[PDB]
Every structure is written in structure tokens, then in C-alpha cells.
Coordinates of C-alpha atoms in Angstrom, one line a residue:
Chain A
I1255 CA 89.9 102.0 97.7
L1256 CA 91.3 102.0 101.2
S1257 CA 89.9 100.1 104.2
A1258 CA 87.4 102.0 106.4
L1259 CA 88.6 101.5 110.0
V1260 CA 92.3 101.4 111.2
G1261 CA 92.8 100.3 114.8
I1262 CA 96.1 101.0 116.7
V1263 CA 98.5 98.3 117.8
Chain B
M546 CA 117.8 96.7 114.3
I547 CA 117.6 95.1 110.9
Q548 CA 119.7 96.7 108.1
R549 CA 119.7 95.4 104.6
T550 CA 122.0 96.7 101.9
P551 CA 120.5 98.0 98.6
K552 CA 120.9 96.1 95.4
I553 CA 121.7 98.4 92.5
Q554 CA 121.0 98.3 88.8
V555 CA 121.8 101.1 86.5
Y556 CA 120.3 100.9 83.0
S557 CA 118.3 102.6 80.3
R558 CA 114.6 102.3 79.6
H559 CA 115.1 101.5 75.9
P560 CA 118.1 99.9 74.2
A561 CA 120.9 102.5 74.0
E562 CA 121.3 104.2 70.7
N563 CA 123.6 107.2 70.4
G564 CA 121.8 110.4 69.6
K565 CA 118.4 109.2 70.6
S566 CA 116.4 110.4 73.6
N567 CA 116.0 107.8 76.4
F568 CA 115.7 107.4 80.2
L569 CA 118.5 106.5 82.5
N570 CA 117.3 104.5 85.4
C571 CA 118.9 103.4 88.7
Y572 CA 116.8 100.9 90.6
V573 CA 117.6 100.3 94.3
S574 CA 115.9 97.4 96.2
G575 CA 116.1 95.1 99.1
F576 CA 117.3 97.8 101.5
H577 CA 116.3 98.8 105.0
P578 CA 115.8 101.2 106.7
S579 CA 114.3 103.5 104.0
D580 CA 116.6 106.5 104.4
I581 CA 118.8 106.3 101.3
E582 CA 120.8 108.7 99.0
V583 CA 120.7 108.0 95.3
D584 CA 122.3 110.1 92.5
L585 CA 122.8 109.7 88.8
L586 CA 126.1 111.0 87.5
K587 CA 127.2 112.1 84.0
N588 CA 131.0 111.9 83.5
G589 CA 131.3 112.2 87.3
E590 CA 128.9 115.1 87.8
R591 CA 125.7 114.8 89.8
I592 CA 122.7 115.1 87.4
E593 CA 120.3 117.8 88.7
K594 CA 117.0 116.8 87.2
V595 CA 116.4 113.3 88.7
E596 CA 113.1 112.0 89.9
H597 CA 112.1 108.9 91.8
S598 CA 109.1 106.6 92.3
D599 CA 107.1 106.6 95.4
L600 CA 108.5 104.6 98.3
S601 CA 107.1 101.0 98.3
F602 CA 108.3 97.6 99.6
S603 CA 108.4 93.9 98.8
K604 CA 106.9 90.9 100.7
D605 CA 109.9 90.8 102.9
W606 CA 109.4 94.5 103.9
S607 CA 112.6 95.6 102.1
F608 CA 112.1 98.9 100.2
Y609 CA 112.6 99.6 96.5
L610 CA 112.8 102.9 94.6
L611 CA 113.3 103.8 90.9
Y612 CA 115.4 107.0 90.3
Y613 CA 115.4 108.1 86.7
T614 CA 116.2 111.0 84.3
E615 CA 115.9 111.8 80.6
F616 CA 119.1 111.6 78.6
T617 CA 120.6 111.0 75.2
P618 CA 123.6 108.6 75.3
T619 CA 126.6 109.3 73.1
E620 CA 129.7 107.3 72.4
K621 CA 131.9 109.0 74.9
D622 CA 129.5 110.1 77.7
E623 CA 129.8 107.9 80.9
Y624 CA 127.0 107.6 83.3
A625 CA 126.8 106.0 86.8
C626 CA 124.7 105.7 89.9
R627 CA 126.0 106.6 93.3
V628 CA 124.2 105.3 96.4
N629 CA 124.8 105.7 100.1
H630 CA 122.9 104.0 102.9
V631 CA 123.7 103.1 106.5
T632 CA 124.8 99.7 105.4
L633 CA 127.6 101.2 103.2
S634 CA 130.8 102.5 104.7
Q635 CA 131.6 104.2 101.4
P636 CA 129.2 105.6 98.9
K637 CA 128.8 102.8 96.3
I638 CA 129.2 103.7 92.6
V639 CA 127.9 101.5 89.8
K640 CA 128.8 102.4 86.2
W641 CA 126.3 102.2 83.4
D642 CA 127.0 99.4 80.9
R643 CA 124.7 99.5 77.9
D644 CA 124.9 95.7 77.9
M645 CA 123.4 95.3 81.3
Chain C
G456 CA 94.9 85.6 84.7
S457 CA 95.2 86.3 88.4
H458 CA 95.1 89.8 89.8
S459 CA 95.7 91.7 93.1
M460 CA 95.2 95.0 94.7
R461 CA 97.4 96.2 97.6
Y462 CA 98.2 99.2 99.8
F463 CA 101.6 99.8 101.2
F464 CA 102.1 102.1 104.2
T465 CA 105.4 103.3 105.6
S466 CA 105.7 105.4 108.7
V467 CA 109.1 106.7 110.0
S468 CA 109.6 108.6 113.2
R469 CA 111.7 111.7 113.1
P470 CA 112.8 112.5 116.8
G471 CA 113.3 116.2 117.4
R472 CA 112.6 116.8 113.7
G473 CA 108.9 117.2 113.8
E474 CA 106.1 115.0 112.5
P475 CA 106.7 111.3 111.5
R476 CA 107.1 110.7 107.8
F477 CA 104.1 108.8 106.3
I478 CA 103.9 107.4 102.8
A479 CA 101.1 105.3 101.2
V480 CA 100.8 103.8 97.8
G481 CA 98.3 101.6 96.1
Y482 CA 98.8 99.1 93.4
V483 CA 96.7 96.9 91.1
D484 CA 99.0 94.1 90.2
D485 CA 102.3 95.8 89.2
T486 CA 100.8 99.2 88.4
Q487 CA 100.8 101.9 91.0
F488 CA 97.6 104.1 90.9
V489 CA 97.6 106.4 94.0
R490 CA 99.9 107.9 96.6
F491 CA 100.0 110.1 99.7
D492 CA 103.0 111.8 101.0
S493 CA 102.8 113.4 104.4
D494 CA 105.6 115.8 103.4
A495 CA 103.9 116.8 100.1
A496 CA 102.2 120.1 99.7
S497 CA 98.7 119.0 98.6
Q498 CA 98.0 116.8 101.7
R499 CA 95.8 114.7 99.4
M500 CA 95.6 111.2 98.0
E501 CA 96.9 111.6 94.4
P502 CA 96.5 109.7 91.1
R503 CA 99.5 107.9 89.7
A504 CA 97.8 106.1 86.8
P505 CA 95.8 107.6 83.9
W506 CA 92.8 105.3 84.4
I507 CA 92.2 106.4 88.0
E508 CA 92.1 110.1 87.1
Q509 CA 88.5 109.7 85.9
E510 CA 87.3 109.1 89.4
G511 CA 85.4 112.2 90.6
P512 CA 86.1 114.5 93.5
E513 CA 84.0 112.3 95.7
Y514 CA 86.6 109.6 95.3
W515 CA 89.6 111.8 96.0
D516 CA 88.0 113.6 98.9
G517 CA 87.0 110.3 100.4
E518 CA 90.4 108.6 99.9
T519 CA 92.2 111.6 101.2
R520 CA 90.2 111.6 104.4
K521 CA 90.7 107.8 105.0
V522 CA 94.4 107.9 104.1
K523 CA 94.9 110.7 106.7
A524 CA 93.1 108.5 109.2
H525 CA 95.7 105.8 108.4
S526 CA 98.4 108.4 108.9
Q527 CA 97.2 109.3 112.4
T528 CA 96.9 105.6 113.4
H529 CA 100.5 105.0 112.5
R530 CA 101.6 108.1 114.3
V531 CA 100.0 106.7 117.5
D532 CA 101.5 103.3 116.7
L533 CA 105.0 104.6 116.6
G534 CA 104.7 105.8 120.2
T535 CA 102.9 102.7 121.4
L536 CA 105.6 100.3 120.0
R537 CA 108.3 102.6 121.4
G538 CA 106.7 101.9 124.7
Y539 CA 106.1 98.1 124.2
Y540 CA 109.9 97.6 123.6
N541 CA 111.0 100.3 126.1
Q542 CA 113.0 102.2 123.5
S543 CA 114.7 105.6 123.6
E544 CA 112.5 108.5 122.4
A545 CA 115.5 109.7 120.4
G546 CA 116.0 106.9 117.9
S547 CA 114.2 106.7 114.5
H548 CA 111.9 103.7 114.0
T549 CA 109.9 102.2 111.2
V550 CA 106.4 100.6 110.9
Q551 CA 105.1 99.2 107.7
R552 CA 101.6 97.9 106.8
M553 CA 100.4 96.0 103.8
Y554 CA 97.0 94.7 103.0
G555 CA 95.0 93.6 100.0
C556 CA 93.3 90.8 98.1
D557 CA 94.0 88.4 95.3
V558 CA 91.4 87.2 92.8
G559 CA 91.8 84.2 90.4
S560 CA 91.6 84.3 86.7
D561 CA 87.8 84.3 87.2
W562 CA 88.0 87.5 89.2
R563 CA 86.7 85.7 92.2
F564 CA 88.2 86.1 95.7
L565 CA 91.3 84.0 96.1
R566 CA 92.9 85.3 99.4
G567 CA 93.2 88.3 101.7
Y568 CA 96.2 89.8 103.5
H569 CA 96.9 92.3 106.3
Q570 CA 100.5 92.3 107.6
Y571 CA 102.4 94.6 109.9
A572 CA 106.1 95.0 110.6
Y573 CA 108.2 97.0 113.1
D574 CA 111.7 98.0 112.1
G575 CA 111.7 95.6 109.2
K576 CA 110.7 92.5 111.2
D577 CA 107.3 90.7 111.1
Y578 CA 105.2 92.0 113.9
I579 CA 101.6 90.8 113.4
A580 CA 99.8 89.3 110.4
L581 CA 96.3 88.1 109.7
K582 CA 96.2 84.4 108.9
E583 CA 94.7 83.2 105.6
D584 CA 91.4 82.1 107.4
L585 CA 90.9 85.8 108.0
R586 CA 89.8 85.0 111.6
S587 CA 93.1 84.5 113.5
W588 CA 96.4 86.3 114.0
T589 CA 100.1 85.5 114.0
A590 CA 101.9 87.4 116.8
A591 CA 105.7 87.6 116.4
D592 CA 106.6 88.2 120.1
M593 CA 105.2 89.2 123.4
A594 CA 104.6 92.8 122.3
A595 CA 102.7 91.5 119.3
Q596 CA 100.6 89.2 121.5
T597 CA 99.4 92.3 123.4
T598 CA 98.4 93.9 120.1
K599 CA 96.8 90.5 119.1
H600 CA 94.6 90.5 122.2
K601 CA 93.6 94.1 121.6
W602 CA 92.6 93.4 118.1
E603 CA 90.7 90.2 119.1
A604 CA 88.7 92.2 121.7
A605 CA 87.8 94.8 119.1
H606 CA 86.8 92.2 116.6
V607 CA 89.3 93.6 114.0
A608 CA 89.7 90.4 112.1
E609 CA 86.0 90.4 111.3
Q610 CA 86.0 93.9 110.0
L611 CA 89.0 93.0 107.9
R612 CA 87.5 89.9 106.2
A613 CA 84.4 91.9 105.2
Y614 CA 86.7 94.5 103.5
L615 CA 89.0 91.9 102.0
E616 CA 86.3 89.6 100.6
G617 CA 83.9 92.4 99.7
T618 CA 85.0 95.9 99.1
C619 CA 88.6 94.9 98.1
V620 CA 87.6 92.5 95.4
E621 CA 84.7 94.8 94.2
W622 CA 86.9 97.8 93.6
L623 CA 89.8 95.7 92.2
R624 CA 87.3 94.5 89.5
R625 CA 86.1 98.0 88.9
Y626 CA 89.8 99.1 88.5
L627 CA 90.5 96.2 86.2
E628 CA 87.5 97.3 84.1
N629 CA 88.1 101.1 84.1
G630 CA 91.8 100.3 83.3
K631 CA 91.2 97.5 80.8
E632 CA 93.7 98.9 78.3
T633 CA 96.5 99.1 81.0
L634 CA 95.8 96.5 83.7
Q635 CA 94.4 93.8 81.4
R636 CA 97.2 94.0 78.8
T637 CA 99.9 91.3 78.6
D638 CA 103.1 92.5 76.9
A639 CA 105.0 89.3 75.9
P640 CA 108.7 90.0 76.4
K641 CA 110.9 91.0 73.4
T642 CA 113.9 88.7 73.5
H643 CA 117.5 88.6 72.2
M644 CA 121.0 87.6 73.3
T645 CA 124.3 89.3 73.4
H646 CA 127.8 87.8 73.1
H647 CA 130.9 89.4 74.7
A648 CA 134.3 87.9 74.9
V649 CA 135.9 88.4 78.3
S650 CA 139.1 86.6 77.3
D651 CA 140.4 84.4 74.4
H652 CA 138.9 81.3 76.0
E653 CA 135.7 82.5 77.7
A654 CA 132.7 84.6 76.7
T655 CA 129.5 86.1 78.2
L656 CA 126.2 85.1 76.8
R657 CA 123.4 87.4 78.1
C658 CA 119.7 86.7 77.6
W659 CA 117.3 89.6 77.5
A660 CA 113.6 89.9 78.2
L661 CA 112.3 93.4 77.6
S662 CA 109.1 95.4 77.6
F663 CA 107.0 92.7 79.2
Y664 CA 103.9 93.1 81.5
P665 CA 103.0 91.8 84.0
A666 CA 106.3 91.4 85.9
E667 CA 106.0 87.7 86.6
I668 CA 108.4 85.8 84.4
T669 CA 110.8 82.9 84.4
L670 CA 114.2 83.3 82.6
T671 CA 116.9 80.6 82.8
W672 CA 119.9 79.3 81.0
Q673 CA 120.5 75.6 80.4
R674 CA 123.6 73.6 79.2
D675 CA 122.7 70.5 77.2
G676 CA 119.2 71.1 78.5
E677 CA 120.3 70.9 82.1
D678 CA 119.7 73.7 84.6
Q679 CA 122.6 76.1 85.3
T680 CA 121.0 77.8 88.3
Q681 CA 124.3 78.3 90.2
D682 CA 126.3 79.3 87.2
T683 CA 123.8 81.9 86.1
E684 CA 123.9 85.6 86.9
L685 CA 120.2 86.5 87.2
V686 CA 119.2 90.1 88.0
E687 CA 116.1 91.1 89.8
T688 CA 113.1 91.8 87.5
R689 CA 113.2 95.6 87.1
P690 CA 110.9 98.5 86.1
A691 CA 111.7 100.1 82.7
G692 CA 109.9 103.3 83.9
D693 CA 107.1 103.2 81.3
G694 CA 104.9 100.6 83.0
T695 CA 106.9 97.6 81.6
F696 CA 109.6 95.4 83.0
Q697 CA 113.0 94.0 82.1
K698 CA 115.3 91.2 83.2
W699 CA 118.4 89.4 81.9
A700 CA 120.3 86.3 82.7
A701 CA 124.0 85.6 81.8
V702 CA 126.4 82.7 81.9
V703 CA 130.2 82.6 81.2
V704 CA 130.7 80.2 78.4
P705 CA 133.9 78.5 77.3
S706 CA 134.6 79.9 73.8
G707 CA 133.5 77.2 71.3
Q708 CA 130.7 75.9 73.5
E709 CA 128.0 78.5 72.8
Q710 CA 125.9 75.9 71.0
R711 CA 125.4 73.8 74.1
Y712 CA 123.5 76.6 75.9
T713 CA 119.9 77.6 75.6
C714 CA 117.9 80.4 77.2
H715 CA 114.4 79.7 78.3
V716 CA 111.6 82.2 78.7
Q717 CA 108.2 81.8 80.3
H718 CA 105.6 84.5 80.5
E719 CA 101.8 84.9 80.4
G720 CA 102.2 86.8 77.1
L721 CA 103.8 83.7 75.5
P722 CA 101.5 80.9 74.4
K723 CA 104.5 78.6 74.3
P724 CA 107.7 79.0 76.2
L725 CA 110.6 80.4 74.3
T726 CA 113.9 78.6 73.8
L727 CA 116.9 80.5 72.4
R728 CA 120.3 79.3 71.4
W729 CA 123.2 81.4 70.2
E730 CA 124.0 80.1 66.7

């Protein structure tokens, strides 16, 4: 499964 | 910006045997950007029913795609893959050789 | 043997042509199992392997939601990067992201990855200690500081060392028949005369899984690396792979050459000689 959080660059 | 030219391999899924159903593949890899045009040709004509894998890429970020279509090779039918990409001045055509 | 699970994300801006194109795919070793295409009709994470189809709606609803979150992040990223490098809002640009984990033959955590690239060039990557970052340039350093301040690396190691390895194992189990198989390559050689004094000897490795393999030609037992035409390992389309290697041999010298094959599916390396 995909990772939970995804922060912008 | 970076531009890598696609490597091209045109081959069949199973060893070619005239009269027997098979799959004609055209594998393009090592290219960048992702915008690319790939067609399979039968005696010079663009094959209509051609599908391709979902866009993915290698460790070095270059993309790779598998275009394929069902077919039954014969003794006289010629197949080839035609590809165009920003790194190619002319569309590149690779003929299918059942020995490669 | 060793195994891995990784997600590949590609985002491509389309200036004046609407929304940015977004594509995500997941793999366990060399088998793809899910996908998401921003231009597709379903707007959902989709199964690409039989063994993942058994997951219930909770799995698909959840992964669809998280993959859409990824999509939005990369849509924001495109604009940010455009700003970082002061670029025209008319040109098309590409951002790629890859992350995943490797487990040893004991299914225990071996290493974690999280890399990012802009227009095909390394941008920022998580170092193997899963605590620090590699910033390609000045723009990347700005992103590095941001990620440090938000303790992103910490959230990533927990996912990479926990969740990632846990689900990989689950996938390996649920897909035992597919993922845990090893198809040793079927091998054979072909001989074709190019002229009256030279001939092509081609060594084939077919229907093997996984993709990792070593295929070489030797003359009198010596490596012929530079006189060998070796093609990239390629997908057969049915989950297996192929690869061949060829050398131009002076007619009458076929016997001096030997093809060597190494693969997890072969207890002992193969050595072939045309004779």
C-alpha cells in the first residue's frame, strides 16, 4: 500500500 | 532539459511458428521525456488494436513501455515497429526479425 | 531470495491543455499490481495482477483516496518547481517520484528508498540512513530544509521499515504462486552465416522470472564483453522475461565460444557451446 502523507517540495 | 533517445526492440512473446497465435511486442526504454509515439506495422500498415503497459521508469528515471498486439505470423507477412520521439528527427522504424 | 516493493509516480504539466497528467504504478519485484491514470475514466486505483484482486473495497477505496492525494501533491509541486527555477508557464515539465523497500531472503528489512527528480535529473533523495537528505542544487536545498522542518524523513522511515515491509510480505504471501515462483530460463542458440567467412551465434534465455540474470559469451573461456551484442532484458508480456547475447564468429571457430547463463532458477550456472 501507498504511504500515508505526501508533503510538497 | 534532458532528452534521452528510446532503445527499441521488436519481438514476439513466444518463438515464432507460422500459423500459430502469438503476441508481437515492441519494447521502448531509456527515453525521456515520456511523450512518445509507438506503432506496430503489418506490411507497412499501422495495426489498429495495439495496447501498451502503464508508464513506468528505471533507476535512472528513464521511461519504458511495452506495446503489444496479438498476431499469427506467416512466412510472407512483415512486421515492424515505428517510433517517434523528440530525440528523433525522423520516425525510426525497426523491422521484426524472428531471430532477435 | 530478495524482494522489493516500489511505487513509481510520473507527473507531466500540460500548459494551456488543462490538468497535469499523473500516473502511478506499483510493483512487487518485477510484477506490476496496481495503477492510477489521471486521464482514465474510473478515477480509481486499479488492480493489474490477479493476486491483488482479492483485496476488498476497503483496500481499493483507501488506495484510491491516497493516490489522489499524491496526485494533488505533484500538481502543487509542478508549480513550485516552476517558481524555484524561474521557468516559463508555457513549457511542459516532468516530476517523478519513486519509493519503496527491499527485504532480504529472510523477508527482513534490507533498505528503504524515496527519490525525486525534476525533468529527468536527480532533485532530492533520502539517504540510506533514512534520516538525512541529498539535495541536488540550491532549489533542492530549499526543499530539503522544508522537509527537515516538517520531520518528513522520520515519517518516511516508519513507513519504509514498517508498513512497506509488512504489506510486501502480505503481497508475497497472497501471491505465493506468482511472486514466489522462479522460472529458470529456457536456453538455446542459433547460428546464422552473415558471409562465407563469418557467422552470428546468438544465445537465448527465455521465459525466466525474476528478471535478474547474467548472460555472457566467452572465447576460450575469456570474457568477450566488448565483442558481444547484449540486449536489454525485456518483458515477454506474460509476466516472464527474455534476453539474448550474440557474437560474430569467424566460420570454423564456433567451438571456441561458450555461452554462460546465471539465474536464481538455475542451481548451477549453464554453459553452452555450439557443437
